Design a protein around this ligand. Sequence first.
Ligand SMILES: *[C@@H]1O[C@H](CO)[C@@H](O[C@@H]2O[C@H](CO)[C@@H](O[C@@H]3O[C@H](CO)[C@@H](O)[C@H](O[C@H]4O[C@H](CO)[C@@H](O)[C@H](O)[C@@H]4O)[C@@H]3O)[C@H](O)[C@H]2NC(C)=O)[C@H](O)[C@H]1NC(C)=O
Ligand SMILES: *[C@@H]1O[C@H](CO)[C@@H](O[C@@H]2O[C@H](CO)[C@@H](O[C@@H]3O[C@H](CO)[C@@H](O)[C@H](O)[C@@H]3O)[C@H](O)[C@H]2NC(C)=O)[C@H](O)[C@H]1NC(C)=O
Ligand SMILES: [Mg+2]
Lengths: 346, 48, 104, 215, 330
Amino acid sequence: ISFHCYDGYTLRGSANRTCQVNGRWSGQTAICDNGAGYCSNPGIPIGTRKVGSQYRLEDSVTYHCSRGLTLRGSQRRTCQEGGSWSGTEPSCQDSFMYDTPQEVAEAFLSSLTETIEGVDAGSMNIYLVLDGSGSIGASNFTGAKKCLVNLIEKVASYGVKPRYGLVTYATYPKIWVKVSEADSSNADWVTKQLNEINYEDHKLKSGTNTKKALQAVYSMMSWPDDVPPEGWNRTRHVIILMTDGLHNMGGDPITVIDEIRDLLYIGKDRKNPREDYLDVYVFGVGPLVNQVNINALASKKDNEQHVFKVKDMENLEDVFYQMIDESQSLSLCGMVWEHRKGTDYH
Amino acid sequence: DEDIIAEENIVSRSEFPESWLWNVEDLKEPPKNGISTKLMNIFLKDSI
Amino acid sequence: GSLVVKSGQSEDRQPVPGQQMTLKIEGDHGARVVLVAVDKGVFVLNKKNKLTQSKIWDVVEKADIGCTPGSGKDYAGVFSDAGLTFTSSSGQQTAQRAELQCPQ
Amino acid sequence: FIQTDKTIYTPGSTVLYRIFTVNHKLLPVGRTVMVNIENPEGIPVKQDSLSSQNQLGVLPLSWDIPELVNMGQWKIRAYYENSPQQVFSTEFEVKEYVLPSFEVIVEPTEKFYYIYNEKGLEVTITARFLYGKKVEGTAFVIFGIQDGEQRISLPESLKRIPIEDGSGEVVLSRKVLLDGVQNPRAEDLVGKSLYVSATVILHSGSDMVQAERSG
Amino acid sequence: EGFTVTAEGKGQGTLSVVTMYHAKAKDQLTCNKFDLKVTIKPAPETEKNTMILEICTRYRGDQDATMSILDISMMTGFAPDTDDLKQLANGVDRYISKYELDKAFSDRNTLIIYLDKVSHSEDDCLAFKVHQYFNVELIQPGAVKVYAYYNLEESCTRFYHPEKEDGKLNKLCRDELCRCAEENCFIQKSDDKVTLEERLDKACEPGVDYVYKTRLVKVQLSNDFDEYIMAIEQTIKSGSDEVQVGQQRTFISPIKCREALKLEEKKHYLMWGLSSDFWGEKPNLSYIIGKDTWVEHWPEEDECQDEENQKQCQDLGAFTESMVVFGCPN
Ligand SMILES: *[C@@H]1O[C@H](CO)[C@@H](O[C@@H]2O[C@H](CO)[C@@H](O[C@@H]3O[C@H](CO)[C@@H](O)[C@H](O[C@H]4O[C@H](CO)[C@@H](O)[C@H](O)[C@@H]4O)[C@@H]3O)[C@H](O)[C@H]2NC(C)=O)[C@H](O)[C@H]1NC(C)=O
Ligand SMILES: *[C@@H]1O[C@H](CO)[C@@H](O[C@@H]2O[C@H](CO)[C@@H](O[C@@H]3O[C@H](CO)[C@@H](O)[C@H](O)[C@@H]3O)[C@H](O)[C@H]2NC(C)=O)[C@H](O)[C@H]1NC(C)=O
Ligand SMILES: [Mg+2]
């Protein structure tokens, strides 16, 4: 299908789009815009419905998918100061759309390198949560162990050595590597811990208590009356977790996520949102996947994807060896990070 | 029931605008008898 | 010139919602044709402010520089009432005109 | 000359408008044109300064309507940059409405009314759908007199006729008309006009349309 | 927000600050030119149900109203008696069109009765019988709409239904926000038992948030929502609410679901529900008994000594220890 606007309108995005084998349309979303708003037209992704024709400042739009379709992304977007909509562009997913192995690692590295080159100065924490529920299998855990080994060497290939945190959970959380250790920034020592873990105790306690795991991640980053720390307004936090979305114990895990953003001073201001200091990536392991629960946990940053759905596990191991063959052109241009020495030429 | 078209199979009419076809056309066809004829293929809206 | 719009499809029956049709645009060569398609349920509420060809010629006819539809009181009054100036080498002229519009 | 796409708009929609720039020979030309959009109070809201050069004398433009806005008769004014004293205008209405499904044409049998016609004034009520089909239902027709802009209604002339096969007939009698002005002389009604209003309601009760023929 | 305006330069200007908002006043805009009272009553016994619909209307103003239009819609499965419409159409100051008289009992679910007038001092009442030509298990309420010919916007619409009070649908509303309550009252009647094979698998679905065992303290009927105060005895599955032994929680059911519950004070019950059934702000919290809430009666300690409840009390006791000690597998 092709798109063509009326007179006096500019077409941005792909004018010619094609339905592919993965049930998705090719190219970018076609948008007819007149250029009369402070923000641009957020447009209508194919399958959605937009409520809100005003595109002025402080305005909002809400999106809804069709019958039997699951929304991925932000249901509500708000025009911010500077001409940039909050959240991310939605996309209607189905019960069978999944993601190709190339599209997973292509978008994941383009998000991750943005919150790495601002750390460039030792000032970045990465949290690793793995689901050991009985709905995944004993044969599907050791294939996920070998996947996580390839992740650490790609991060250390940029010259940045962050602090890692390893927690595997099921009914209870088990902390293997804490971020408050003297050896957590040594990237080779954490890789030695990843082979020494054993999942025989998590198989006995078969369950999916997501909320009690995230309460252990909250206890690692919180400070017990330490009184503002030196990296409170300068530390990037990256949370990576795999799950199936089928949690039945502990309760709604979203209530722990809102406690984390309040502790990091995110959203508690109108002039400084601080959205670049918390990124959350959720990966879907099996066909048994609730796409609603995995979308509400992941972050929603602009022009970027954080929700992924793949099947058979081994293809997710195929995206981790492919991402180390992919070289990212690091750009030191246009980088201004907020250091508290605000004299000019900074 | 079992007879009739299934309700889920029916795709509903949705496009009911009040005005459309706001386009520019240039009569670049060869002029016979001082008259240029452009044939346009347009898609009609769902309004009755 | 001329501009006619008719059905490019050979009549057929009354078309169905969603059906494609062919529109015949018949006009002058090298002309930019602009289009609009309006629901006829709009003209029930308001039939004022339609752009027609007869309303265009009404504006052109009310901007002419001639006032009286025929003749005048003298020879110079014929020209000023029809919208012309005359001047000659023998002294015969028309009256001055300092108003852009007609009298009364 | 200013073209609009519709004559009435709702809040929240967008108004599309073209401007055709010609000279004194009705041939296209390229000038600088100032464009204004005025509220019902007569205050310009948005101003622009466009040029019709390299555009073949057609200037496509647009304007969005806010959700909270003043209703009434809006105005669009435009003029050449070298002749600001000669302004050209076209109006459009802003109202909260929905579209009807049928029109009502109120046409009397003659385009006037004679005083000494004892038959009265006969008015034909035509009601058909947008797609050409005819309308079954009931109508409500009332006459009235107008002197200048002060309108005087005539409640004695209320009739309720059924509309069969998209047609209906209603007559205002002369004795009802002479009893409304309280005038013993019939020659003083020369100069005044008459206006008829009709309201047709369907048999399902789902829609109704008010129409009026005045002057 | 309070803001500052800095104005510099040469000349005069005019600043205007207007705020548009929705004002909460009286909600009295419906029935502003009319008053409409519609009631549906059953017919007496002669010798296929028949009921009597009574409609009364009155104009608000200093004079009697002009010609007005009544838009009567029927309940689904009900049609007017053809003899009673002929009585009112030949009556004085009334007219029903001949297109509506000879429709017979085929399709006459909408009806327009044209009134020549309606008074402003006394109510002008009419009544006619309706026969039930098609018995359906669920009946949609009909509506009566009153308006004059010259202004459709100044109308008023009342509903009628023989069970629900004046045709209103069941909704749950607290602090302006309303949720739909025209669904089922519990999940299912069940009685299939099967113990953990049909009870653990429902409780370990990913939608189930909380599993509690409570005790009813006080039943408080209060207008829109019914309050059931449940003191929490033990926490079987700890949901998203941190609650200890002895604390109380408030439960909400609509009016039409009060009969299907049959909850009695000083009794113990077992209840589970979804995490979308939460409707409480601050540390106060209100639970919703919707169509995705399981309700089962827990008999007390001496009540399990019956041989009829012996099969059921061994089902409930083993359900607790499989969730307390082991939790939900997978
Ligand atoms: C990390 O968190 C801490 C705690 O919130 C934060 O401290 C803040 O530092 C800024 C400076 O970087 C302070 O801002 C100024 O503070 C002085 C007093 O120390 C005030 O007088 C200032 O007001 C004037 O100056 C402004 C321009 O400098 C003018 O715009 C203004 O109108 C006044 O003339 C100014 O507020 C701030 O007060 C503290 N806050 C607290 C609670 O201590 C620190 O900056 C954070 N780090 C980073 C990198 O953001
Ligand atoms: C998007 O794809 C479309 C096709 O799907 C591209 O349209 C192509 O446009 C050219 C104009 O340069 C067309 O050429 C002309 O076609 C008309 C047909 O009536 C003919 O009369 C003219 O003499 C001229 O040859 C071409 O036909 C058309 N392609 C097809 C398949 O019809 C369009 O350019 C693409 N746009 C972008 C941005 O990719
Ligand atoms: Mg599980």
